[PDB]
RNA sequence: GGGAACUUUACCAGAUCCGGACAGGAUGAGGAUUGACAGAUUGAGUGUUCUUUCUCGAUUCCCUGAAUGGUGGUGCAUGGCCGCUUUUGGUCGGUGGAGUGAUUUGUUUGGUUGAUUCCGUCAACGGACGAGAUCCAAGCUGCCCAGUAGAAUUCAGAAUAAUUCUUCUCUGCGGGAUUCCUUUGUAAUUGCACAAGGUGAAAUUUUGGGCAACAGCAGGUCUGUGAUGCUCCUCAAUGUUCUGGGCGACACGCGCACUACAAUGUCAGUGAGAACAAGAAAAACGACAACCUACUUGAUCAAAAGAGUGGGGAAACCCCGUCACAUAGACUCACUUGGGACCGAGGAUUGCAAUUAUUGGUCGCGCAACGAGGAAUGUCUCGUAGGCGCAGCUCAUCAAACUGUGCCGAUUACGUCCC
């Protein structure tokens, strides 16, 4: 499902990603233009998927998750999108 | 306005718990905070401040845009700062991350703490206590306390001079806990003229 | 009523003033601005 | 538009460190201000048993807050209040106030 | 009712170092204390001012430890 | 923080699910797949499943390894937290001295203090903790201050609306308390102090607390927690299910802890009537108000209910019972005009569901004990016990629980070490 593409895309222009843990439909994102949502249970199933890949930097507190992508995740996330200037975080400041 | 203080309490409780997770080896000594108008900036107190800024903006902005994304502020109302904590010694919470690191580094315990004991007591601190409990020297439920200088444990006056931290070190085979108390060189911090039992007489 | 810091939905959680802090106890979770007096 | 100020903050030397000091930006200047006293103080009192466990000497905590409300009253400067409050930067956790009535 | 060595000691430094405090008045001998001494609490001075007058009054009886420059 | 139901839930009876991350691999022409109406399947209009076609758009599914999850065990592997030893006044070191040494002195006879608190004496001298003191609330008080506090007055009006203020209330920071005079007092040339008395709101750590050393306890917790070591489980799972139903709560008057009710003529039972209190709470987002409470209708006919209007984000509220009442009220030598248990009939209510949720709901059962409590046992001394009652916490619904506030308000010791 393409939902899973834009969540990927949604790291760019955002960078660090914040999700409260529920077992229920919730989403914080898709934001600059559309700002519409997706269920978290399925978000969580996507992060673990390639989280076994080094791409991502875990954090956790309380009920919230905090995802930042490692450089290897920047580069992959670029090329999976096929569009690759580089992640927003290093593009300007 | 009861619950508008509680929402900040629950808020402030969230920032502190979160940074501790992710500001480490980077000497996280705490947070101060206030806001007025469209600025949520949240200064950060820290010891090792070039890993919080980063090579290219990353760590401070990587921690910026999640707090807009956690607490939902519309993008740009946050800032961030970092404040060099003068005399790295005198802040315990900076020096538990010293212990944690040092014990991960496989050091034996007495050598580990007793150094920090000097560094803090060197830094101007008026005292210390360092206590490592855990499975050290296994099968024992053995605890150890390492003392310096001098200190006050009773009354509520201590909470002014005593700023301490209790944080776990997760070893193999079990846990090893770590606790550091320290002092404030009564001088410039607080200074309320502060340990009661010292009266002065101007002559 | 699962509550804030943990899955809990146990260690019955204070509703009082709608701060829900019991998950990781209001002892471990603090800086809320509470103090220990009396 | 006589305006109104409700300063609600806990911490030591904030509630004081604005209204006492920081109204003398208006107080001693072109504004004419009506001071009342701060409203009464509240305490928010939760008491939880100290034991994570069952066993105890049956002991309880009592944790408290203090919330400090100050009301401070005005005649009507126009656009000065926007300048009034903005004069003085110093505090934290203290409360900004936009009020109209009568 | 019994005074800690802290009350005792500091009050011996005052009488050693101030003969401004003279009258058996607790109230006069108090108002000289708090300006000159910082104990950060009132009771200390209230204790100190009480014992400081015991010392002075007793000096008139005879000598007292921490003897004056007289 | 145990007041429930299904949830929470671990336990039981079955059924669903992948949560199983990672690829290092045997069918990529109707794809191992995902989801599905009906039909049967089943407890289930639940699709798991069987048929029937399609809805399938690859992330899923098959095979290996890893794994993840958990109220799984071990609190005797463990952190942290907690209790307890421990309500007391205790503990530790440097240099010095004594001892072959373990160790000891310091840390003591004596006097005093709640106090290892003081003074004195002193092979010890100088220091660290604990005590004290800082703190927090209560009491008298200053300054500021009132349109989200409330008094004085005049002027007119019913029944013979203008003015000025801080007594009352608000609160930040301050005053006040100290052993201060007195008693030739007790004791005593010193000292440290004690008492009866004085001043004062307060008179002896003013009062009630919070804090609280050093050593320990195989004290409790792996059901608080991405807090944790093992090693059990890993897909007809000990994982998960707003998953379905049941339990955790059952009737041998079983034995035990804590609490509420109370049997009297001292409210005593009850019917009316008069007054007056205080800490405390109150609310909703990724939508276009869900919290309380006052008023008045429900009221041509019960009660609790239903419904409409009205402001409060909290200084929206103050009529609580104990008591007062002789109001000439009713009882009336009794298991009773005092138990409210057991009880079957209606009815209003919160809500997925109440088959006793619960109740100023009625009204039947009263004939169930019960009639100062056997040995034995509890905890405190002044606004105190006791009595009374009110909110809070849990809470969709429910307090004989706890947490806190206030009202009524006591006799006995101001002592000893006997237990």
Automatic annotation (TrEMBL), chain A:
Compartment(s): Cytoplasm
Family named by the database record: Belongs to the eukaryotic ribosomal protein eS10 family.
GO MF annotations in UniProt: RNA binding; structural constituent of ribosome
Residues of the whole record sequence present: 38 to 130 of 153
Keyword annotations of the record: Cytoplasm, Ribonucleoprotein, Ribosomal protein
Transmembrane segments: none
Protein name per the record: 40S ribosomal protein S10, putative
Annotated Gene Ontology cellular component terms: cytosolic small ribosomal subunit
Domain Plectin/eS10 N-terminal: 1-93
Organism classification: Eukaryota, Discoba, Euglenozoa, Kinetoplastea, Metakinetoplastina
From TrEMBL, chain C:
Disulfide bonding pattern of the chain: 3-6, 3-21, 6-21, 6-24, 21-24
Cellular component per GO, a single term: cytosolic small ribosomal subunit
Coiled-coil blocks: none
Superkingdom of the organism of origin: Eukaryota
Alphabetically ordered keywords of this record: Ribonucleoprotein, Ribosomal protein
UniProt keyword Ribonucleoprotein present: yes
Molecular function GO terms recorded: structural constituent of ribosome; zinc ion binding
GO biological process: one example: cytoplasmic translation
Family in the record: Belongs to the universal ribosomal protein uS14 family.
Protein's UniProt name: Ribosomal protein S29, putative
UniProtKB/TrEMBL annotation, chain D:
The protein, known as: Small ribosomal subunit protein uS10
The Small ribosomal subunit protein uS10 domain, residue ranges: 4-98
GO BP terms: translation
Domain of life: Eukaryota
Annotated family: Belongs to the universal ribosomal protein uS10 family.
GO molecular function, one term: structural constituent of ribosome
Pfam family name, one: Ribosomal_S10
GO CC aspect terms: small ribosomal subunit
Listed SUPFAM superfamilies: Ribosomal protein S10 (SSF54999)
Keywords: Ribonucleoprotein, Ribosomal protein
Keyword Ribonucleoprotein: yes
Entry-linked InterPro entries: Ribosomal_uS10, Ribosomal_uS10_dom, Ribosomal_uS10_dom_sf, Ribosomal_uS10_euk/arc
Organism, scientific name: Leishmania donovani
């Amino acid at each position: 499902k393409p939902s899973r593409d834009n969540v990927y895309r949604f790291f760019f222009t955002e960078g660090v990603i914040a999700c409260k843990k529920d077992r229920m439909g919730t989403w914080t994102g898709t934001l600059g233009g559309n700002t519409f949502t997706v269920p978290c249970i399925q978000v969580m199933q996507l992060m673990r998927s390639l989280k076994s890949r080094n791409l991502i930097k875990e954090q956790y507190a309380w009920r919230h998750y905090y995802w930042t992508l490692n450089d290897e995740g920047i580069a992959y996330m670029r090329s999976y999108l096929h569009l690759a200037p580089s992640a927003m975080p290093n593009t300007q400041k | 306005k009861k619950r508008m203080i509680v929402r900040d309490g629950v808020f402030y409780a969230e920032l502190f718990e979160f940074l501790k997770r992710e500001l480490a080896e980077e000497g996280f000594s705490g947070v101060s905070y206030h806001i007025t108008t469209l600025r949520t900036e949240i200064v950060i107190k820290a010891t090792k401040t070039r890993e919080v800024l980063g090579v290219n903006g990353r760590r401070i902005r990587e921690l910026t845009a999640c707090i807009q994304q956690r607490f939902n502020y519309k993008e740009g109302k946050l800032q961030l700062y970092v404040e060099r904590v003068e005399v790295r010694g005198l802040s315990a919470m900076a020096q538990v991350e010293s212990l944690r690191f040092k014990l991960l580094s496989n050091l034996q315990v007495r050598r580990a703490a007793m150094g920090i004991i000097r560094y803090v007591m060197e830094s101007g601190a008026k005292g210390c206590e360092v206590t490592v409990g855990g499975k050290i020297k296994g099968q024992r439920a053995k605890s150890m306390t390492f003392r310096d200088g001098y200190m006050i444990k009773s009354g509520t006056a201590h909470k002014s001079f005593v700023d301490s931290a209790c944080r776990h070190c997760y070893m193999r085979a079990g846990c090893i806990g770590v606790k550091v108390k320290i002092m404030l060189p009564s001088d410039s911090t607080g200074r309320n003229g502060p340990s009661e039992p010292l009266p002065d007489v101007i002559t | 009523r699962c509550c804030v810091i943990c899955s809990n939905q146990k260690a019955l959680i204070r509703k009082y003033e709608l701060n829900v802090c019991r998950q990781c106890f209001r002892e471990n979770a603090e800086h809320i601005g509470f103090t220990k007096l009396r | 538009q006589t305006v109104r100020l409700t300063i609600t903050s806990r911490n030591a030397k904030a509630v004081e460190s604005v209204t006492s000091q920081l109204l003398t930006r208006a107080r001693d200047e072109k504004v004419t201000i009506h001071g009342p006293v701060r409203l009464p103080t509240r305490t928010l009192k939760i008491t939880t048993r100290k034991t994570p466990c069952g066993n105890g000497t049956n002991t309880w905590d009592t944790f408290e807050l203090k919330i400090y409300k100050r009301i401070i009253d005005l005649h009507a400067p126009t656009e000065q209040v926007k300048k009034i409050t903005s004069f003085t930067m110093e505090s934290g956790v203290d409360v900004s106030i936009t009020i109209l009535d009568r | 009712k019994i005074r800690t060595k802290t009350v005792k000691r500091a009050s011996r430094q005052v009488v050693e170092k101030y003969y401004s405090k003279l009258n058996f008045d607790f109230y006069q001998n108090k108002r000289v204390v708090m300006d000159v001494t910082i104990a950060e609490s009132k009771k200390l001075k209230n204790k100190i001012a009480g014992y400081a007058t015991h010392i002075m009054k007793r000096l008139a009886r005879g000598p007292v430890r921490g003897i004056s420059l007289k």
